[PDB]
Amino acid sequence: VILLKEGTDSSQGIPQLVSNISACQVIAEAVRTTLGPRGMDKLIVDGRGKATISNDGATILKLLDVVHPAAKTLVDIAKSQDAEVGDGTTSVTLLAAEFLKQVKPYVEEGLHPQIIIRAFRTATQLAVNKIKEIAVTVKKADKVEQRKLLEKCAMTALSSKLISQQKAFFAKMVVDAVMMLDDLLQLKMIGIKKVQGGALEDSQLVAGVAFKKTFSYAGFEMQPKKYHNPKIALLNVELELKAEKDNAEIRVHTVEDYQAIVDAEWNILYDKLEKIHHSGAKVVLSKLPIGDVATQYFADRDMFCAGRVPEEDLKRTMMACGGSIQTSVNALSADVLGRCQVFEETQIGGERYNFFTGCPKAKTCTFILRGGAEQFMEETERSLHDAIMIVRRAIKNDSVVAGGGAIEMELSKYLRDYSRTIPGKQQLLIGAYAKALEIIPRQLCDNAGFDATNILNKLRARHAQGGTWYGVDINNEDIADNFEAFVWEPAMVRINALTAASEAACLIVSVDETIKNPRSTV
Amino acid sequence: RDKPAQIRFSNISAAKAVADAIRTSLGPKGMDKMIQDGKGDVTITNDGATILKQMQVLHPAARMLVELSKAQDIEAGDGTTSVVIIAGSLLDSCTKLLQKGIHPTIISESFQKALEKGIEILTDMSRPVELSDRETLLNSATTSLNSKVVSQYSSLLSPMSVNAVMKVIDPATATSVDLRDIKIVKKLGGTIDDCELVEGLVLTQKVSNSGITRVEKAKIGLIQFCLSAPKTDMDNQIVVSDYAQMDRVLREERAYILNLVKQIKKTGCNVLLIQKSILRDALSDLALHFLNKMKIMVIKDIEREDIEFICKTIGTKPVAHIDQFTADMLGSAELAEEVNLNGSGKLLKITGCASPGKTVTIVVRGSNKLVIEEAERSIHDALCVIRCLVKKRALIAGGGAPEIELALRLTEYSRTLSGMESYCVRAFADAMEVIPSTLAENAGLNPISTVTELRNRHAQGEKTAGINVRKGGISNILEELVVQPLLVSVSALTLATETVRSILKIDDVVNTR
Amino acid sequence: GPLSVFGDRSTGETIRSQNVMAAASIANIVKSSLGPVGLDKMLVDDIGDVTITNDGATILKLLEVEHPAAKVLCELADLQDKEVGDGTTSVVIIAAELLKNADELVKQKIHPTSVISGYRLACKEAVRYINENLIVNTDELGRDCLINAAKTSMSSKIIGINGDFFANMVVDAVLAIKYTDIRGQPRYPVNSVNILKAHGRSQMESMLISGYALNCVVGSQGMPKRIVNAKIACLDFSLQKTKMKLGVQVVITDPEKLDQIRQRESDITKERIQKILATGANVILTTGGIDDMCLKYFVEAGAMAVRRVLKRDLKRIAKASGATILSTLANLEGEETFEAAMLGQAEEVVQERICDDELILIKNTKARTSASIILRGANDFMCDEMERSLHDALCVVKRVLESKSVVPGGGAVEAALSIYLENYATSMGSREQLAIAEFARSLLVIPNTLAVNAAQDSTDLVAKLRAFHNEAQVNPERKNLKWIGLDLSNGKPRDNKQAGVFEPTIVKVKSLKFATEAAITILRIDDLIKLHPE
């Protein structure tokens, strides 16, 4: 009798881990060129035809699926980094991949997971401490320099992303956009309206809040489309002919009672209207639909009404305008009412967007970006989201590190020169770690088709005993202190990178064998 | 009507794509390409004509290019990787002429005049060459080899090629050389180092006796007629009517055979040679027994048309009858020895012949059959290089100089030309920059920088300083010993321009049975 | 537009890696089969032919390979066997790892030309250094260095435990056919010592014959089976019922002759038989058949006659006993006579039974000696294993004796060459210096494979050997360390002379030449077109 159920199998020992390392390299090479200012972009197609185009590595890895364990580990680590930082995901996936590649041949001869895991963990610890100790910072606490370096880090983020002609333009845009936000830094108070047509340069920042005008019945277009200081009431109440609680029943006996009841329903409606009108507000917004009678009344009363508004829209309305959400009208007073100095139903690219500005309070913003492709606008919006993430993390800890591969060569040099005191196979394996730590600038150079060997040689010579912060320019194709080129990115990215890299290395090197069920559950 | 124009555009695009397909195999720094056939073979290849051949494609344009490459190899022989690139580049350039309202007949006439000017452009560019001048021919053939894969032993494959052209024909005057004079053999196994030459020839069959396997100063004999039992060309049967007749038949058969063998032995022969035949062949066991009793070699079953090679090499001449067989007609070679290939067969090399032979043979060995195939094709194309060199004596150095010179001077002609033809001439001028662009590209260079550098160098008017793959840029070529005959370039250009004039005229394709 | 190729083109490093992949897949598959600790690999043919094999070429030859470069490596292994016959497994591994290093290097974006020229020059320098800086003497040995060579041959084989008897046997067998070619140097007729085998009792039950044993037996028990003195008559003429000529027809109107013609059919044969039997013939050897007429006559004479005798063996035995090849009795002219001046010389011939079957055996061909080995084993497969083992050993020893030069091994040559070439490679200081460095590194696989096949701590021993060789080279004051190699008997750095581990220099030279040749061949391959199949 078969010991286990029929259909299973298992690979073991060196062959299993060799296959795993091979899978790691195969999945790694799929994004070999994305990162870098000169990045070259990829596409995917699904069975629904919703083709998606992106150069941010983590999103790319989600766009792809595997069944291999190691590659699944890689893609989930990419998920973790993206949720953690949102930049350099390409860098972390790549780097772990070449560590595993560099260690591959070591399995064929005498070597055990113990020493390699200990070396990986201790090196990761020491290098994270290095990250903390030599991370650059403003250390100035003045808002001018703070804002300047926020924009510099934003363009650093764009120093490997798609757009490169609007770096400072969009950096200042997003920095201001977040500086009209509170200390909560809520991720729901950032309106996004992708607009067809219009140049990429025409993307803008609404100081107040704008949104889309939802469908409305007849009786519109008599309302005044302009006011110079309206007052806003934020509702969540229905202005439509509705039964009381959907279960009410009416039991009368004569036509007079019938007429009294129907006129009474009308009186309820018109009394709510009277409360609203006499309240003094000039506009009303709500999730709930507005009956045509109310719209005709407000047009007759020169007042604007709108319903069926999505919640997040109303949330932004409260958070910026300064009003308060209402489910009831009976206790409407001044403190509940919002207030702004500008209302207008403007036209932005063949659409009808309701614009509310002139609010002295402003704790939320709604981006209005212009372009000609849903996919390219989506990619730009994704990069905007990435920039939001990077600045939101960095705004807490205003300490960063220079991009352009300078810091990676710094840490590689540190590990190398220190990896001459450590003993034995630990020393050799740590040297392999350090050698694997020398690819990302090389990959940037070869992305642009440059002689990366020569570039790395010269920058290593310059890093050895001739100063630090030397990065690789691509428009100049040379080496110099490109830290003063202000390509600076946060260091918690580096720490998280090392954490995930050590995690992955020790995980996959701990792999020894796997049994595969016949997977009848399909 | 437009559909003919769309067909024309489609054909031009197909030709361009086919040409671009082989854009990593040109010149000194080209790269090989696998062609695995549907059959159970495989071919590593670098020569353009070969590559073009193995694609059994169905599109007419590539077939035209294949036949063009065949014609060029017949004319010149080397590196037909370039001509396809030139043809495709001219087609792409004339796409721009077509979109700019230039009638196809007008385009063809523009090509004709461009050909006219370019002939002189190359002609004045070149300089004559000295026959028997070792260095010029050596550099020409070596640079020819540098477009192939066996360049690692060029120091060995050059002297053999040069000695071939000295010892095959006289350097006095021939205007052309018979290639079938030169002979080669390919053998599986051995090494590139084992490759060598002999001024004689080698025979494949091994002597039917092991008693004598290396004879020196032998009087070699060649025989081509039947040796078997007495039998008429026409049918018969010898009827025996008793035991005595049987006895006489046996004794007289023996007597006739030994009489013949004694005739040849009396002629002073040392080594026997028997041709191949069917239908009562020309060898008997009793003959071998007799020859062993008199210490004589024999080789049997040899080819018909090879008689001239053997007779010219050794001096022994064919006889179909014993009566015309004479002792004076013995070819005398110093040494006939059998060699071993370390368990890979036994040959027979004939050396020290006293008769003047005008044919030579060379051997090639290597770790496999494809390496020796590539070396054979390379040596054949080098022999073609030298045949063109002696055909007419004019040279042109490489380094990208010729095409850029022609490009810039056609640019000047366009500057000095008016009418519709001016822009066509400009298009010609811009066309000859593809080859240097490819040479810089596959050399791992930034094409814009180096190509513009050479363009400016030929704007200065100074030359002998062109593309250098050792310096890494534009530098001197005479020290690089990079030279090709003017004839190969002239043939390439003329064949390409005639082909493309045919192309421009042609615009319609129809499918038949 | 789309390429008219109609086939499939793969570009980039993929096919390169695929060649690597090919160079990977087979390599480790045969990895377990060379060195004193190489274990056997079992192969089952599709028709149920299970096989034992340890030498690489025999291992690979029956694999079916469709990947081109892998086929190329296949015939590379086959040639490594057919000329050298030793290192039967090492060469494919060396080439595979060389391809690994090369393809990784090109993946780091270096011009292929620099690395290919590096390959050629490094092959040349390596062969050179092997030639000069490891010269030792074999005249200090002899009749015992051959024993040690046989020991190194059997190291991975099946009889590595009982080498004391077998090595002496094989060296004496070599001495038994030692011939001279150019009258100043020796010569060996390879494949002229028939090794006929039997599913005997044990390896210790095989015996060597100072004579010759056919695959042949006595035609009938009527003949005497032990002739006192051997005057041998070798024949190629077919002794069947004589047929005059294929182009004769009889026409008889006088019937009296008719019956007498029936007589003739015998007479001629019979007559020659008398002639054959006039000279006191002892044994008759013919390729042609022998019928009842000749059988009865030979029984009446008591002289052995064997039909269906092969040809090459007949030539061997005729030369050994001094006999002569005969196809007819005709002399320099029509006189057909038999001469008693060339009869083969031997002591006696017997139809000896070995296990359960008999065979013809020749005793002491006169004026010289001859070699043939009767391989008796527990079964057929392992006996074939000794067959291959001893063939390989004879190839090794004939290479040794042709060129009396040998150096110790077990990684001794490997580590010494690696140390030289790594401490060398400053003659260029350029893009090719790194190439020479990778050559010095890539020879690390031989100690690696030996250690993994022996479960030794590879790094410690390789460091010890490398340090000794490095200090010997850079400091020639104590150059004695250059006479040290690695032995897997106990994982020891030893003077590889007491074990006798010794291999001909030409073997390493030739293997290195073909290895680098194939490596260059592949490194000048970059693109593949898969044409549509027929």
PDB file of C-alpha atoms in Angstrom, chain A residues 182-343:
ATOM      1  CA  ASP A 182      -3.973  68.808   9.582  1.00  0.00           C
ATOM      2  CA  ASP A 183      -1.667  66.750  11.808  1.00  0.00           C
ATOM      3  CA  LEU A 184      -3.957  63.717  11.472  1.00  0.00           C
ATOM      4  CA  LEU A 185      -2.676  63.190   7.903  1.00  0.00           C
ATOM      5  CA  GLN A 186      -5.802  61.253   6.969  1.00  0.00           C
ATOM      6  CA  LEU A 187      -5.601  59.330   3.691  1.00  0.00           C
ATOM      7  CA  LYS A 188      -9.296  59.874   2.923  1.00  0.00           C
ATOM      8  CA  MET A 189      -9.148  63.688   2.660  1.00  0.00           C
ATOM      9  CA  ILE A 190      -7.311  63.866  -0.685  1.00  0.00           C
ATOM     10  CA  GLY A 191      -9.773  64.361  -3.527  1.00  0.00           C
ATOM     11  CA  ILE A 192      -8.746  63.080  -6.952  1.00  0.00           C
ATOM     12  CA  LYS A 193     -10.505  64.154 -10.153  1.00  0.00           C
ATOM     13  CA  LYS A 194      -8.909  62.806 -13.322  1.00  0.00           C
ATOM     14  CA  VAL A 195      -9.857  65.169 -16.152  1.00  0.00           C
ATOM     15  CA  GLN A 196      -9.956  64.246 -19.826  1.00  0.00           C
ATOM     16  CA  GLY A 197      -8.052  66.565 -22.127  1.00  0.00           C
ATOM     17  CA  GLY A 198      -5.744  69.285 -20.878  1.00  0.00           C
ATOM     18  CA  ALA A 199      -1.964  69.213 -20.697  1.00  0.00           C
ATOM     19  CA  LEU A 200       0.027  67.391 -18.039  1.00  0.00           C
ATOM     20  CA  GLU A 201       1.271  70.822 -16.965  1.00  0.00           C
ATOM     21  CA  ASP A 202      -2.360  71.838 -16.388  1.00  0.00           C
ATOM     22  CA  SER A 203      -2.758  69.582 -13.346  1.00  0.00           C
ATOM     23  CA  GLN A 204      -3.705  71.783 -10.426  1.00  0.00           C
ATOM     24  CA  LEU A 205      -4.591  71.957  -6.730  1.00  0.00           C
ATOM     25  CA  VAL A 206      -8.063  72.974  -5.550  1.00  0.00           C
ATOM     26  CA  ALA A 207      -7.687  74.952  -2.326  1.00  0.00           C
ATOM     27  CA  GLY A 208     -11.308  74.257  -1.401  1.00  0.00           C
ATOM     28  CA  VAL A 209     -13.131  71.117  -2.523  1.00  0.00           C
ATOM     29  CA  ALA A 210     -14.513  70.278  -5.957  1.00  0.00           C
ATOM     30  CA  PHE A 211     -16.401  67.171  -7.027  1.00  0.00           C
ATOM     31  CA  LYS A 212     -18.651  65.822  -9.761  1.00  0.00           C
ATOM     32  CA  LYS A 213     -22.237  66.972 -10.188  1.00  0.00           C
ATOM     33  CA  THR A 214     -24.393  63.854  -9.982  1.00  0.00           C
ATOM     34  CA  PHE A 215     -27.520  63.298 -12.055  1.00  0.00           C
ATOM     35  CA  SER A 216     -30.442  65.600 -11.291  1.00  0.00           C
ATOM     36  CA  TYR A 217     -34.050  65.564 -12.436  1.00  0.00           C
ATOM     37  CA  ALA A 218     -35.904  68.318 -14.278  1.00  0.00           C
ATOM     38  CA  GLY A 219     -36.297  71.814 -12.890  1.00  0.00           C
ATOM     39  CA  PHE A 220     -32.567  72.535 -12.800  1.00  0.00           C
ATOM     40  CA  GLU A 221     -30.791  75.374 -14.687  1.00  0.00           C
ATOM     41  CA  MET A 222     -32.969  77.985 -12.998  1.00  0.00           C
ATOM     42  CA  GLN A 223     -30.849  77.837  -9.849  1.00  0.00           C
ATOM     43  CA  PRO A 224     -28.326  80.660  -9.425  1.00  0.00           C
ATOM     44  CA  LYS A 225     -24.998  79.211 -10.519  1.00  0.00           C
ATOM     45  CA  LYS A 226     -22.989  81.848  -8.642  1.00  0.00           C
ATOM     46  CA  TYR A 227     -22.800  83.311  -5.145  1.00  0.00           C
ATOM     47  CA  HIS A 228     -20.230  85.582  -3.507  1.00  0.00           C
ATOM     48  CA  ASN A 229     -20.484  84.232   0.047  1.00  0.00           C
ATOM     49  CA  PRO A 230     -22.855  81.254   0.366  1.00  0.00           C
ATOM     50  CA  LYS A 231     -23.464  79.234   3.518  1.00  0.00           C
ATOM     51  CA  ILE A 232     -23.356  75.448   3.286  1.00  0.00           C
ATOM     52  CA  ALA A 233     -25.500  72.933   5.162  1.00  0.00           C
ATOM     53  CA  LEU A 234     -24.276  69.329   5.174  1.00  0.00           C
ATOM     54  CA  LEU A 235     -27.234  66.932   5.219  1.00  0.00           C
ATOM     55  CA  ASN A 236     -27.821  63.199   5.243  1.00  0.00           C
ATOM     56  CA  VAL A 237     -31.611  63.454   5.028  1.00  0.00           C
ATOM     57  CA  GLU A 238     -34.094  62.613   2.285  1.00  0.00           C
ATOM     58  CA  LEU A 239     -36.104  65.345   0.567  1.00  0.00           C
ATOM     59  CA  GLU A 240     -38.351  62.962  -1.359  1.00  0.00           C
ATOM     60  CA  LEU A 241     -41.929  61.786  -0.925  1.00  0.00           C
ATOM     61  CA  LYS A 242     -41.400  58.722   1.260  1.00  0.00           C
ATOM     62  CA  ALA A 243     -43.470  56.645   3.631  1.00  0.00           C
ATOM     63  CA  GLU A 244     -42.602  57.316   7.253  1.00  0.00           C
ATOM     64  CA  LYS A 245     -40.592  54.213   8.201  1.00  0.00           C
ATOM     65  CA  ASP A 246     -41.546  51.902   5.282  1.00  0.00           C
ATOM     66  CA  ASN A 247     -43.928  50.011   7.600  1.00  0.00           C
ATOM     67  CA  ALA A 248     -46.467  52.709   8.479  1.00  0.00           C
ATOM     68  CA  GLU A 249     -50.106  51.976   7.695  1.00  0.00           C
ATOM     69  CA  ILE A 250     -52.983  54.418   7.303  1.00  0.00           C
ATOM     70  CA  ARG A 251     -56.515  53.596   8.447  1.00  0.00           C
ATOM     71  CA  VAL A 252     -59.133  56.294   7.830  1.00  0.00           C
ATOM     72  CA  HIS A 253     -62.832  56.257   7.014  1.00  0.00           C
ATOM     73  CA  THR A 254     -63.832  59.279   4.894  1.00  0.00           C
ATOM     74  CA  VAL A 255     -62.504  61.322   1.994  1.00  0.00           C
ATOM     75  CA  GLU A 256     -61.869  64.296   4.283  1.00  0.00           C
ATOM     76  CA  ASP A 257     -59.426  62.244   6.353  1.00  0.00           C
ATOM     77  CA  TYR A 258     -57.720  61.112   3.149  1.00  0.00           C
ATOM     78  CA  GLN A 259     -57.281  64.679   1.927  1.00  0.00           C
ATOM     79  CA  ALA A 260     -56.115  65.791   5.364  1.00  0.00           C
ATOM     80  CA  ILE A 261     -53.466  63.065   5.458  1.00  0.00           C
ATOM     81  CA  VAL A 262     -52.096  63.746   1.990  1.00  0.00           C
ATOM     82  CA  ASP A 263     -52.002  67.503   2.585  1.00  0.00           C
ATOM     83  CA  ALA A 264     -50.317  66.662   5.887  1.00  0.00           C
ATOM     84  CA  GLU A 265     -47.583  64.772   4.046  1.00  0.00           C
ATOM     85  CA  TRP A 266     -47.161  67.823   1.831  1.00  0.00           C
ATOM     86  CA  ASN A 267     -47.007  69.948   4.973  1.00  0.00           C
ATOM     87  CA  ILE A 268     -44.219  67.785   6.386  1.00  0.00           C
ATOM     88  CA  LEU A 269     -42.317  68.244   3.144  1.00  0.00           C
ATOM     89  CA  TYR A 270     -42.883  71.990   2.978  1.00  0.00           C
ATOM     90  CA  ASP A 271     -42.088  72.424   6.670  1.00  0.00           C
ATOM     91  CA  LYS A 272     -38.724  70.771   6.147  1.00  0.00           C
ATOM     92  CA  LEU A 273     -38.304  73.119   3.185  1.00  0.00           C
ATOM     93  CA  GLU A 274     -39.237  76.091   5.381  1.00  0.00           C
ATOM     94  CA  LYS A 275     -36.728  75.053   8.027  1.00  0.00           C
ATOM     95  CA  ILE A 276     -34.017  74.751   5.374  1.00  0.00           C
ATOM     96  CA  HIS A 277     -34.841  78.052   3.683  1.00  0.00           C
ATOM     97  CA  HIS A 278     -35.306  80.090   6.862  1.00  0.00           C
ATOM     98  CA  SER A 279     -32.097  78.528   8.182  1.00  0.00           C
ATOM     99  CA  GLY A 280     -30.208  80.838   5.810  1.00  0.00           C
ATOM    100  CA  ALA A 281     -28.016  78.322   3.969  1.00  0.00           C
ATOM    101  CA  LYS A 282     -27.674  78.816   0.221  1.00  0.00           C
ATOM    102  CA  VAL A 283     -26.659  75.256  -0.757  1.00  0.00           C
ATOM    103  CA  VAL A 284     -27.575  71.786   0.523  1.00  0.00           C
ATOM    104  CA  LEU A 285     -25.643  68.547  -0.002  1.00  0.00           C
ATOM    105  CA  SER A 286     -26.474  65.006   1.076  1.00  0.00           C
ATOM    106  CA  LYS A 287     -26.244  61.331   0.296  1.00  0.00           C
ATOM    107  CA  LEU A 288     -29.919  61.242   0.070  1.00  0.00           C
ATOM    108  CA  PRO A 289     -31.878  61.929  -3.115  1.00  0.00           C
ATOM    109  CA  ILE A 290     -33.664  65.254  -3.441  1.00  0.00           C
ATOM    110  CA  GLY A 291     -37.223  65.076  -4.719  1.00  0.00           C
ATOM    111  CA  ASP A 292     -38.168  67.136  -7.748  1.00  0.00           C
ATOM    112  CA  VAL A 293     -40.547  69.209  -5.610  1.00  0.00           C
ATOM    113  CA  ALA A 294     -37.664  70.400  -3.436  1.00  0.00           C
ATOM    114  CA  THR A 295     -35.581  71.231  -6.507  1.00  0.00           C
ATOM    115  CA  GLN A 296     -38.428  73.235  -8.042  1.00  0.00           C
ATOM    116  CA  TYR A 297     -38.930  75.012  -4.719  1.00  0.00           C
ATOM    117  CA  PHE A 298     -35.257  75.933  -4.411  1.00  0.00           C
ATOM    118  CA  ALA A 299     -35.155  77.131  -8.011  1.00  0.00           C
ATOM    119  CA  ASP A 300     -38.235  79.193  -7.183  1.00  0.00           C
ATOM    120  CA  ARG A 301     -36.365  80.275  -4.040  1.00  0.00           C
ATOM    121  CA  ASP A 302     -33.077  80.810  -5.915  1.00  0.00           C
ATOM    122  CA  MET A 303     -31.264  78.134  -3.921  1.00  0.00           C
ATOM    123  CA  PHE A 304     -28.989  75.266  -4.955  1.00  0.00           C
ATOM    124  CA  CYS A 305     -29.753  71.671  -3.990  1.00  0.00           C
ATOM    125  CA  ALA A 306     -27.865  68.443  -4.623  1.00  0.00           C
ATOM    126  CA  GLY A 307     -28.166  64.908  -3.286  1.00  0.00           C
ATOM    127  CA  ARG A 308     -26.839  61.358  -3.692  1.00  0.00           C
ATOM    128  CA  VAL A 309     -23.375  62.692  -2.847  1.00  0.00           C
ATOM    129  CA  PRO A 310     -20.789  59.997  -2.032  1.00  0.00           C
ATOM    130  CA  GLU A 311     -19.711  59.922   1.600  1.00  0.00           C
ATOM    131  CA  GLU A 312     -16.025  60.753   1.114  1.00  0.00           C
ATOM    132  CA  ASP A 313     -17.069  63.875  -0.786  1.00  0.00           C
ATOM    133  CA  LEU A 314     -19.179  65.017   2.162  1.00  0.00           C
ATOM    134  CA  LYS A 315     -16.361  64.072   4.542  1.00  0.00           C
ATOM    135  CA  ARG A 316     -14.016  66.392   2.677  1.00  0.00           C
ATOM    136  CA  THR A 317     -16.789  68.991   2.745  1.00  0.00           C
ATOM    137  CA  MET A 318     -16.964  68.935   6.544  1.00  0.00           C
ATOM    138  CA  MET A 319     -13.205  68.694   6.961  1.00  0.00           C
ATOM    139  CA  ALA A 320     -12.422  71.760   4.822  1.00  0.00           C
ATOM    140  CA  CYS A 321     -15.527  73.974   4.863  1.00  0.00           C
ATOM    141  CA  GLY A 322     -16.023  74.000   8.626  1.00  0.00           C
ATOM    142  CA  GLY A 323     -19.631  72.866   8.846  1.00  0.00           C
ATOM    143  CA  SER A 324     -21.130  69.781  10.434  1.00  0.00           C
ATOM    144  CA  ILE A 325     -22.950  66.790   8.970  1.00  0.00           C
ATOM    145  CA  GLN A 326     -26.692  66.778   9.612  1.00  0.00           C
ATOM    146  CA  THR A 327     -29.159  63.932   9.767  1.00  0.00           C
ATOM    147  CA  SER A 328     -31.834  66.290  11.131  1.00  0.00           C
ATOM    148  CA  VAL A 329     -32.919  69.851  10.427  1.00  0.00           C
ATOM    149  CA  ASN A 330     -35.005  70.685  13.508  1.00  0.00           C
ATOM    150  CA  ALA A 331     -31.972  71.999  15.426  1.00  0.00           C
ATOM    151  CA  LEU A 332     -30.252  73.820  12.557  1.00  0.00           C
ATOM    152  CA  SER A 333     -28.285  76.787  13.900  1.00  0.00           C
ATOM    153  CA  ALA A 334     -25.275  78.926  13.006  1.00  0.00           C
ATOM    154  CA  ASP A 335     -22.574  76.622  14.398  1.00  0.00           C
ATOM    155  CA  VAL A 336     -23.745  73.718  12.236  1.00  0.00           C
ATOM    156  CA  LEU A 337     -23.746  75.779   9.040  1.00  0.00           C
ATOM    157  CA  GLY A 338     -20.728  75.858   6.786  1.00  0.00           C
ATOM    158  CA  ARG A 339     -19.571  78.974   4.985  1.00  0.00           C
ATOM    159  CA  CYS A 340     -17.530  79.846   1.896  1.00  0.00           C
ATOM    160  CA  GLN A 341     -16.914  82.904  -0.259  1.00  0.00           C
ATOM    161  CA  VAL A 342     -17.092  81.211  -3.682  1.00  0.00           C
ATOM    162  CA  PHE A 343     -19.503  78.756  -5.252  1.00  0.00           C
TER     163      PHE A 343
END
